[model samples]
Target chain A: FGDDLLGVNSEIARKLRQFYLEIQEEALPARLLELLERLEQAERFG
Target chain B: VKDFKQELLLVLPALRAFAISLSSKHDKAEDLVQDTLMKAWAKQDSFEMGSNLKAWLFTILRNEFYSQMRKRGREVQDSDGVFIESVAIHPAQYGSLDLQDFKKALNMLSADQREAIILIGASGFSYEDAAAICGCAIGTIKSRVSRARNRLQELLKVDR
Candidate 1:
């Protein structure tokens, strides 16, 4: 089920990891960051 | 407390990525992340100090996602608006499937399994943290992660 059975992750695991990497590489939008900033300010004072 | 703010801000990008991956819909994911941040901020006292803040927020984000999924009958609302094909990616390997196909394979799993995959595989959460986030046993988390990976492998057909 792992490297032992699939002979070093069977390539799919490696590729799947790459897929996640690419997904994560997409740029984070400004809206969420703005929300975080606002939330921090509010929580800091509220 | 000031240090806590920095840590939370640092984890935001990763949390949003996990939200997007789990929801598969930008709007839903955005809403989820927004709600999670609000809740996390409001409950900062409940958070353990100087420990794994990322895991705590992932748990909150994931809990919000599951709540939404439950409300909508075992799945997050699928918007199909700018989820897969719209996003560009430079894969680490040339032989790997494209991001669109990988997105499809990811969507093929159940919401629960998908959460496990994102938390453990993508977000780098431990099995124990995954179990705590999923509110299940450690063995259950282990099995879910294994099954999610195997199912993805099968769907993408990179095993052969």
Candidate 2:
């Protein structure tokens, strides 16, 4: 099982960065962009 | 060790947004983000390499928000609805009103419904992808999103 990877925190951020980069490289879907934008705008104005 | 602050700063906006999405109130959201970051920093050694960092952070923030909410024993008042209701409504304000109404309606939904809508509608993930993220069957995800859209339409009283 891959469960061993579940709690490994040391490189989690790096993994996330890679994951995000993969999504970005694959042409991030418009809806995700919109969601992120909404969240960004809301935080900015909140 | 790489500066946690530097990495955190890069993701702060998204982190704040995720916190706000869960907490609604600015102060509560800030507190949630703070708690999540602190926990992440403290437990940095436990994080797995090549894992989903954004998802991990989001999960942390969400857990913190729910933990605090549970401790407070506060009713889950629909902040999104309350925010819309408090705003002035007029034809000139239609766009903003609709936006706020949509947000409120989203908040009013059950967790499954909201998650479905977020994954499918907002996040643009396919039902299959959403199912994988949610650890459920694709059919379940589809049904949830379908029901969620119908419920939101009903809540907003939108014409079919």
Candidate 3:
């Protein structure tokens, strides 16, 4: 069971990376980008 | 202070990615990331100058996620149907399995296990740091990651 799991573990790890990469590749939401600018300006003036 | 905001900007994409990973909904993820940014900006003074900004932001986002979860007394499900449309546009593959199928199986796990696996396996956090981010012991994180991998192996059916 241990040996079998070793192979499966690495495979799952690979898939996990695959899943995260997909999300990471997405363009940042426009709202989030705008929020950054708002935050910067608030700190600048306030 | 100016440099600190610049550093925060550099990690925004990572913070957004993590928000999506945890929430699995594009719009909710957007709201969560927005909330995290506001809070982090408000409390920027607490952030040490030379620390890991990404990890620190992740902790803030994770805490906000669970805090909202507890307040609602239920798991937040994606009702807007935007997440699927967003992620499924790309026909990605993973060892004969559809990436959508992998995502479905991933969504099936408990939040604890899912975050544990994503942090340690995908996001590349060390066990120690993952523990710190989750506010748990290293052994507990190891246990969660171990259980998560086993469950995902069964779910994905990657028999060798």
**Would you list the C-alpha lDDT of every candidate in the order shown?**
0.72, 0.53, 0.75
Q: Determine the backbone clash count of candidate 2.
A: 8
TM-score of each: 0.78, 0.53, 0.81
lDDT of 1 by residue, B49-108 (tens): 776888899888888877776666523345433323233334534444587667667889
Clashes of 3: 0
Task: Show where candidate 1 strays beyond 4 Å.
Answer: A1-8, A43-46, B74-97
User: Which regions in candidate 2 have their CA more than 4 angstroms from the true location?
Assistant: A1-46, B24-26, B74-99, B123-142, B156-160
The sequence of per-residue lDDT tens digits that candidate 3 reaches over residues B11-129 is: 87777767776875535677888889889888888987777777888999999998876654433243432224233324453333366677677788888898998888878788889
Name the top DockQ candidate.
3
* Backbone clashes in model 1, listed as residue pairs: none
Off by over 4 Å in 3: A1-9, B24-26, B74-97
Q: Give the TM-score ranking, best first.
A: 3, 1, 2
Q: After best superposition, candidate 2 residue B37: deviation in angstroms?
A: 1.1
Residue pairs with colliding backbones in model 3 are none
lDDT of 2 by residue, B1-160 (tens): 3354456556655665444444444345556766676677667668778765555565566667667866555444533323311221112121223433444566788867765665555443556666766668987887786677667657767533
After TM-score superposition, the amount by which residue A34's alpha carbon in candidate 1 deviates from its true location, in angstroms, is 1.9
The TM-scores of chain A alone, one per candidate, are 0.73, 0.39, 0.72
| Model 3 TM-score on a 0 to 1 scale | 0.81
lDDT of 3 at B4: 68
Better of 2 and 3 by lDDT: 3
